[PDB]
Symmetry: C2
Subunit: 176 residues, 2 copies
């Protein structure tokens, strides 16, 4: 039966307006838990993908990485990286589905009136996604990954007005 | 005490350059002993903030503990911390000696690998967090994620495990 960190779904969102030089978000979604990692990058490149996944796979090495035919994932350099780590690459052909819809939508709404600030608020976006309940499942992505680290479970330890307000804004989009 | 209460941060390096990288930011969780490693090009406030933004996307730590390094005593880092709600404290305990031994072992591991330290960095982290330490009675990974993953076959990977195990278990 499927475990956390068994399978990753990866995608690039962007370009978004420049925000401290960043233009894209590498989205990583765990197959079993629904847990989302957001990595800001300057380009949707193999290079940025490898660096981000080297950080993530310092935790655990996935068996499978699934992605579309983006240039970052179909390169020989990305294929070589995966081969070295023993990871299989899966490519898409015509919980995880609705996860990526929600992120593009959340990041779009986040820009209104503060387009160059999405980079600063990205940690709060990830934090809200992983600590919000999904329709059919009984646990948050975070509960499922960490077993069922916060000093305050309501605010998720956020203290800054715009971040707390952001949490609220995201819960409203996810629950309504 | 819960995980993410207190982080201990520091830089190792400079190390022989590898595709531009020269430094490793070391973040150690006070309660679990879990270590996160991030390669950087400089021991800068900027690299530190980029790495910590990634980590604090998981949970916001109450306290970050560091030395007087330029990265950590800057006003930029003060502003970043105050905005996130994190108390910065600076050095002038079972938890303090554990973190010190992690740094010594890590330095030994990275310095001992002048041409490969960067490429092996994720393996350094995984092997360290998933090795039984007699001081913890668990692996750091178990203490973080809830109380085998080290089935690594490559020559450089077994060499890492062997060296960590020797350091921890030999009298």
């Amino acid at each position: 039966p499927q475990k956390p960190f068994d399978k990753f779904f990866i995608d690039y969102i962007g370009p978004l307006p420049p925000s401290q030089g960043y233009l894209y978000v590498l989205v990583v979604v765990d197959g079993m838990t629904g847990f989302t990692w957001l990595y800001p990058t300057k380009a949707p490149s193999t290079s940025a993908t490898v660096k981000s996944l080297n950080v993530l796979t310092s935790i655990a090495i996935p068996r499978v990485i699934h992605s579309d035919q983006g240039a970052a994932f179909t390169s020989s350099t990305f294929a070589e990286w995966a081969k070295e780590r023993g990871i299989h690459l899966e490519f898409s052909t015509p919980k995880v589905e609705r996860k990526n819809s929600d992120i593009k939508r959340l990041l779009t709404k986040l820009l209104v009136g503060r387009p160059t600030k999405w980079y600063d608020l990205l940690p709060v976006v990830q934090l809200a996604l992983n600590n919000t309940y999904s329709p059919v499942l009984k646990y948050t992505p975070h509960q499922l990954l960490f077993g069922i680290p916060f000093a305050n479970q309501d605010t998720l330890d956020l203290t800054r007005e715009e971040e707390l307000s952001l949490l609220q804004e995201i819960r409203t989009s996810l629950y309504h």
